[PDB]
Design a protein around this ligand. Structure first.
Ligand SMILES: [Mg+2]
Ligand SMILES: [Mg+2]
Ligand SMILES: [Zn+2]
Ligand SMILES: [Zn+2]
Ligand SMILES: [Zn+2]
Ligand SMILES: [Zn+2]
Ligand SMILES: [Zn+2]
Ligand SMILES: [Zn+2]
Lengths: 105, 105
DNA sequence: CGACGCCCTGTCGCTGAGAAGCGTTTGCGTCG
DNA sequence: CGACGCCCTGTCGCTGAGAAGCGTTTGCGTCG
């Protein structure tokens, strides 16, 4: 698949309690799905757990999506706090992402 | 147009005398054509004058295309020398491009 | 290196991906 | 700032562009 997936900014008002209930706690408990899942930028795993929504208009693609364990262990932030933050920008947007590809550059 | 144009490596044996005869000398003498023309990376002008062919396999798109005046005035190299060089890499490939966008980063 | 044990329960490799060009576009300077 | 003159004959702005995910993928260490 060549082209870049769209990036949609979800307001904090549109975040539902069901989405917060589905924030992954342990990476071994993830459920893989090629259709309904979403891909975390850190671990590069496409799973159905709730992931962070980057709210920077300049942000693009799926770089802003992070899972529970990855955001917690690699950046000390909670996905639930990130989803409820109207001004939350992804670590790639802030230029502090430590994934195997971004730290390489 | 969203997607990236292909990059084709032309061996020095395939360079013809007609192509060398069409290397631009003065940027004011260029002929614009949206169909048959090619775009220089430095001046960002799509014209029909012969342009450099970057021979790095890792190179992609049309970043390696430079016109006569731009390569001469901005990098001190001749397009004819570049086209006849089997190991010629574009200034973006060498990370020394001084166009308005690359020097900005 | 893949079995087990520990506490802070965890993450890299490969492929193919990585714009392009039309429009407000061309060096320097006195000078009206 | 857009006419003119100079020699080394020239280049920036805007838009939309800027992957994604399956596969060889999960912290630390003694130890067989
Ligand atoms: Mg490629
Ligand atoms: Mg865009
Ligand atoms: Zn993750
Ligand atoms: Zn972002
Ligand atoms: Zn990253
Ligand atoms: Zn040019
Ligand atoms: Zn190149
Ligand atoms: Zn450049």
């Amino acid at each position: 698949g060549s082209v870049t997936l769209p990036h949609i900014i979800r307001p904090v008002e549109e975040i539902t309690e069901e989405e917060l209930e589905n924030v992954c706690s342990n990476s071994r408990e993830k459920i893989y799905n090629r259709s309904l899942g979403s891909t975390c930028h850190q671990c590069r795993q496409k799973t159905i757990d709730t992931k962070t929504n980057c709210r920077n208009p300049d942000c693009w693609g799926v770089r802003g999506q992070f899972c529970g364990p990855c955001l917690r262990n690699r950046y000390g932030e909670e996905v639930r706090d990130a989803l409820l933050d109207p001004n939350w920008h992804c670590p790639p947007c802030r230029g502090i992402c430590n994934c195997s590809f971004c730290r390489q550059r």
